[model samples]
Target chain A: RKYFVAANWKCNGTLESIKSLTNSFNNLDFDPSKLDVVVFPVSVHYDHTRKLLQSKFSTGIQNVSKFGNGSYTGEVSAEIAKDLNIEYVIIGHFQRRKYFHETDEDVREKLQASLKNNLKAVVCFGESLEQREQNKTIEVITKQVKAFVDLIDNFDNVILVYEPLWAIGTGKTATPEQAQLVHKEIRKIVKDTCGEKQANQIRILYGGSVNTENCSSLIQQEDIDGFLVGNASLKESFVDIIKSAM
Target chain B: RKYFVAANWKCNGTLESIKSLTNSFNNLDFDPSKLDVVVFPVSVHYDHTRKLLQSKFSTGIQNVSKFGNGSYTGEVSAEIAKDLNIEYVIIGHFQRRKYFHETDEDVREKLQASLKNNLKAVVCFGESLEQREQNKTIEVITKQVKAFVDLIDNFDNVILVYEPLWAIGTGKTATPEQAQLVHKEIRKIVKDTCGEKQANQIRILYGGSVNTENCSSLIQQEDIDGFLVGNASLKESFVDIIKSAM
Candidate 1:
């Protein structure tokens, strides 16, 4: 499986700031054949970032409408993303689940929409601190990941990112060992649901608090294929994390 | 009051379709002094539409983050829209309320965020088919509208849109008499809460099933200062709707 690194900029950046970042992104020594890179910007900045960034670096919208293109109001439908040739879509983000009322069912509709529109989906799921302490990590992760992957006709455009709610934006890091065990279990779950070949072909990524310092060890794990980066993705240091995978 | 005409494109538009529409927009005799026009495209097209449309024709984001700015995935914060110099923001869109589970509390926070960022707000609220039939039209509209307007320090930046839930995309419009009663009721509610000065200053717009055939009569109502357009806005006929106000 090829390595992938995604920048989840979330609801951040202005044209001037995005312009400044694209300057750094153009210089990223990335080879898509070995490691793929996609940056998620708020929809307003999609056109602006595309204008300033090099064409080789892919771009993603943070979310898409479950409903196709129409007057759903204020949503960017998957069809619209396809029309503009957006590369990937991030779905069921933890923040969306906690804050925006997105559910497993919503994730399914959005995932199906993303695939139907021919956009790659970076599907996120994981246990929170409470769930992990209770030893229910596998139960929660399997349920969330399986919801999207089972519907996926093929794994070619499906990427799974395991982000513990406790780690996101909390300055806490999951140890390489802790993350790999979950990744391995995730693979087994996929293998059981789909098949060994499909499971081997799928890329499982680690997210939350992934910085350049821990990226080397994290990528060294057999099951940790890549990362869905948060804070590190916004800064110039993101290039270093990408090189670790390369 | 300067008439405010907004095209709440909702979850619609492609760069190609937007580019094609702007060709017609530029030829229209629009004078920003008498009538203000803002188009709400899904955020992805903000940069693209701005490049193609006339500068006098303003732009808006369909929604914004209640949080100022941070690592909130897939949201465009009011801070970001302000940073990019976006002029208007459509808040409390009914669709967001029903489908995305946005509460009146959510609407209040978003309206406050928009004003704090210096973005004019086109706040939408109205009764549903069931609510209207049960004779709770005024009660529901009052709660929804007052929730946002009551928090307003001023009405200069707020425009209220009255769109009946039964009419949106159903191709069934409330007659001129029907919508005017709700618009007048909305203005009276604002007058009672925020004083007559603000009530007079606030532009009450009618949305839902607004077409060229009905726009002239809707704009003629004393309480109807303008419209928050839907389908007509996507086509070349949007110019005529603008002219009805001019």
Candidate 2:
């Protein structure tokens, strides 16, 4: 499987800030054959960032609307994103679930919308701090995954990001052992549902407080394909994390 | 009061569509000194459209986050918009309120965020089809306006849009008389709370299925300063709507 590293900027950065960061990556010497690099900035800057960045690295939108087009004000539809050559859409982020009340059904609809427009989907699912503390992590994660997987007839362009809500942006990294078990279980679920062929072919990413120091160890796990880096993705250390995947 | 003509291009238009529309306006002549012209495209294309359209006509974001810059994913905050020199923001359109579950209180917070960034607001409030049918239009409009007006210390940079939800994208328009009564009532609500000076200075725009045929009579209403056009705004007749205001 090819390693995939994505930077989730999460409502941060301006044009000047993104320009400086995108400029920094243009000169970075990384082997393109080993890993696929992607960046997820706020939707408003997708067009501008694509124009500014001069790397083979692809750009992704942090969110997209379930509606294809027309009448839904303040929404950016996947059809428009695909037309602009946006390759990936990050959906069902914990922030969207908590703040915007995005439901499993909403995630399903958004995933369908993304695939319809031929945009790759980085569909996110996870157990919250409360669910984890109650020892319901797998149960919660399974239900979330099932809701999303059930909506898909094919997983050719879908990637799953297993983000622990407790670990996201709190500086609390889930140990490599804990993440590996979850990733393994996620693959097992995929195997049972879609059979072994797609199970191994599909990439399950570990997201939530991934930094350079922990990235190397996490990437060593069998089921951990790569990462969806949050805060660390903004720093030069993101390059370090991407290198760790290689 | 200066007439304000705004195009609320709800979830419509791609990069190519926008470029074509904006390119149409580049050579077209309109007296900016007579009235102000603004277009609210999907947020993703704000930067691109702003660059394509020449001066005199400005760009407005359809919605903004109630929160300032922070960890709100899938959200575009007013601070970033102001930083990028976006001059206007439209908030509390019936679609956002109905589809996104935005409440009156939510509208208040967004207005505060807009005013905090010193971005002018084209704040929208309207009675739904049921409310208007039940003869509660005045009460509903009053409460909606008060919720938004209560949060503002000054109305110097605010424009009110009275969109009857029944008419939005439905090919049905609130008659010039029906729209005038609501606009007059909205201005009274403004006067009662913010004083006569503000009530007169703040433009009250009528929005719904405003086409070229109806725009002439709509603009002639005593309280209707201009229009916040929907489907008609996407057509060349939008130029006629702007011209009607002059």
Candidate 3:
């Protein structure tokens, strides 16, 4: 299996900060054969960052409008992103749901739009603190997964990022056993719905408070394929996380 | 009054389309002293379009995050925009309220962020079809205006666009009298709350179904300072609209 490490810069970083981070990547010598690396920067920096990376690294957008090419103001559609050669798009992010009120249907629409435009989707799903406390994590994550599973017949080009709302940026993380349990269930759900062949082919990454110290053990699990690094992504520690994937 | 014409390329235009449209602007013969022109392309194109326009034309962002920055994925904040030298931001746009579920409070927060970052705001407000049919246009417009007016101490760097929901892209413009009535009342609302000197200093624009044919008659009214054009903004008719402003 080819492990993937996707850095979600997440509304952080200025042009100079991004330039410094991307410059750091050029100095690191890692085996690309063992792992794949991609960066999801804010949409404002997508084009400029792509140029800065100069194809040394991959780039993606944090969100895209479900709508097509017209009338929806202030949105960047997948078509435009694809035209600019942006390879991945992160959708159904919890932040979008909390702040922008995006629904499961909205995420489905955005994913469909991204795939239609030939952009890969890093589809995210998770339960809030209350739902997790209620012991409804499996049900909530399943429902979120079903939204995408029902829409697309194939999951070959999609990467799933499981981000628990409570742990996100809260200096808390699900223990390796906890995250592994959920990741295992997600794989089982995919296997049940899409069959064993496609389920094993899909990569499920854990996000939320993943630092270099924790990421090594997390990625060592059976079902946890990689990570969607958030706050840690902005610092040099992200390099260690990427190296751990190897 | 120095007339201001802002083009809202709402969810429309490609790189080529914007290139051609901007290329078209270079041929126009309007005097900048009598009028000012600004363009709000989709966020993806802001940096590229800013370089294209250089200092010849002013540019603005269609929307900005109410939050300052950090960890708010899928959002572009006014601080980032201002850092890019973006001069204006469009807030309280009806499409944002309708599609993205932005609240009046959301608009207030966004406007506050823009002003804090020293960016001008083109704030939009108007009644829906039902509100207009119920003869509550004045009440609705006043309530929407108050969202921003109550939040800010001054209106020196603001432009107001009154775009009735039903008239947007429907090819059904409110008659010159209908638009003038609302513009006049919006001015009164501002004058009552923010005082006469700042209110008169404010530019109130009429948006929705504004085309070359009807633009002249619309701008001829006493209250209509200029236009926040929609579909017409992408066409050659936009030149005529700016010329009408002059």
* Top lDDT model: 1
lDDT of candidate model 1 versus the reference: 0.86
Determine which window of 10 residues in candidate 1 chain A has minimal summed lDDT: A164-173
Clashing pairs in 3: none
Candidate 3 falls in which docking quality class? medium
Residue B203 Cα positional deviation in candidate 1, in Å, after optimal superposition: 0.3
Clashes of 3: 0
Compared with the true structure, what per-residue lDDT tens digits does model 2 show for residues A1-246?
888888898878888988988888666677666777889888777777888876578789889998888888899899888877889999999888988889999899999899888899999998877788899988998889888786565565788999878676566668898999999999999988778988988888998778878999999999999999888988866788888876
Q: What DockQ, on C-alphas, does every prediction get?
A: 0.84, 0.78, 0.75
TM-scores for every predicted model: 0.97, 0.96, 0.96
lDDT of 3 by residue, A1-246 (tens): 569898998888788888888888767787666677888888778777787764546789899989998888888888888777778889988888888889999999998898888988889999888898898998899999999875555565788888878676566667989899989999998898888888898999997678888888999999999988888988976888988986
Cα lDDT tens digits, model 1, B1-246, are 888888888787887888889899889977888789998888888888877888889888888888878877888888888888899998888888889898888999999898888888888888887787798988898888778787777676888888788776555668889888888889899999999988989899987678788888999989998999987889998898888888
Of the true contacts between chains A and B, what fraction does model 1 have?
0.91
Residue B43 lDDT, candidate 1, scale 0-100: 86
Per-residue alpha-carbon lDDT of candidate 3 for residues B128-217, written as tens digits (9 for 90 to 100): 887877989988888888887865555657889988786755655679998898888989998898888878888999877788889899
| Candidate with more favorable, higher TM-score: 1 or 2 | 1
* Backbone clash numbers for all candidates listed: 1, 0, 0
**Least well predicted 10-residue stretch by lDDT in candidate 2 chain A:** A148-157
Instruction: Score each candidate by Cα lDDT.
Output: 0.86, 0.85, 0.84
